[PDB]
């Protein structure tokens, strides 16, 4: 795409009660090829006791709808598709995703489960590492200035110039519907925005340094696994994410791969 109005889709989804989102998200991730093929209608209907609305005083059911996959064609900007849903849902409630251990098999088969096992320690070890393309420092007491942490700071400042209203809008609204969003990659749920295998970076994680790239890392693992087992995960993720108005910093992916890829391959499923 490119033309998806995430603010409205983000609002729509944020007007629902957690469990019916959680219900939807779970199904659409771990049985996407399933529920889609068996759904009677131009829409997929999610229902749960937790979502209701009062129609003039009476508690009436409030289902949540996801329009079926239209191969582009009739694609409104505010149309909520399974792909479009999984992508934003994920970025919004990674804590909950974590809590209910929601892992799409698409990510499970590249070891996602083990990867996230000690996430903080992992990301904190990584940020602590010396960064290949920073200079060493004359003053030994200035060694932080050469760490990966330091490179991400320069990245934070870069993406900040490249921000769109629509998505900032969405982060704003997200944050006092108390979405479990986050500002830094070194936080305990961050990696979990990819557990459900979005097709692109979750909009609410798009301006947190290194997050979009973390996605492509997972995408690239997916291609390796496919190579070992003609796939195009990374390309699709690249195109689709960068459509959101941000260029990937090809260097951060390279730092991820080099640090984590040896051990990742050992935990694939083949």
**What's the gap between Cα 100 and its chain centre?**
16
DSSP 8-state symbol, 209 = T
- List the alpha helices (DSSP H) in 31-78: 32-37
Resolution (A): 3.0
The b/e string for 82-121 (b: 16+ C-beta within 10 A; e otherwise) is bbbbbbbbbbbbbbbbbeeebbbebbebbbbeebbeebee
Q: What angle do CA 25, 29, 34 make, to 5 degrees?
A: 115
Q: Which residues does residue 130 pair with via DSSP β-bridges, in sequence order?
A: 147
Q: Are strands 52-55 and 58-61 parallel, antiparallel or unpaired?
A: antiparallel
- What's the per-residue H, E or C state across 122-187? HHHHHHHCECCCCCCCCCHHHHHHHEHHHHHHHHHHHHHHHCCHHHHHHHHHHHCCCCCCCCCCCC
Handedness of CA 66, 67, 69, 71 (dihedral sign): negative
Question: What's the CA gap between 4 and 8, in Å, rounded?
Answer: 9
Q: How was this structure determined?
A: X-ray
Distance CA(13)–CA(21), nearest Å, equals 7
């Amino acid at each position: 795409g490119q033309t998806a109005d995430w603010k409205s889709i983000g609002l729509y989804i944020l007007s629902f009660a957690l469990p019916i989102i959680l219900k939807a998200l779970y199904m659409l991730s771990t049985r996407g090829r399933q529920t889609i093929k068996e759904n009677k209608g131009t829409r997929i209907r999610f229902k749960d006791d937790s979502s209701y609305e009062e129609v003039n005083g009476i508690r009436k059911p409030r289902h949540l709808y996801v329009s079926m996959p239209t191969a582009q064609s009739t694609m409104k900007a505010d149309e909520i598709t399974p792909g479009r849903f999984r992508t934003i849902a994920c970025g919004l409630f990674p804590a909950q995703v974590k809590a209910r251990n929601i892992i799409s098999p698409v990510m499970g088969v590249i070891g996602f489960s083990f990867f996230v096992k000690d996430w903080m320690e992992r990301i904190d070890d990584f940020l602590a590492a010396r960064c290949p393309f920073l200079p060493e420092q004359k003053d030994p007491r200035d060694a932080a200035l050469a760490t990966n942490r330091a490179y991400f700071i320069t990245r934070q400042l870069q993406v900040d110039e490249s921000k769109v209203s629509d998505i900032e809008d969405l982060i704003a609204d997200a944050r006092a519907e108390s979405a479990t969003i986050f500002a830094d990659i070194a936080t305990p749920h961050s990696v979990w925005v990819f557990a459900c295998a979005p097709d692109r970076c979750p909009p609410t994680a798009l301006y947190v340094a290194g997050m979009p790239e973390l996605g492509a890392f997972f995408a690239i693992l997916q291609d390796m696994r496919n190579t070992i087992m003609k796939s195009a995960f990374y390309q699709s993720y690249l195109r689709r994410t960068q459509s959101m108005g941000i260029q990937l910093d090809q260097k951060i992916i390279i730092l991820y791969m080099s640090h984590w890829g040896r051990e990742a391959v050992n935990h694939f499923h083949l």
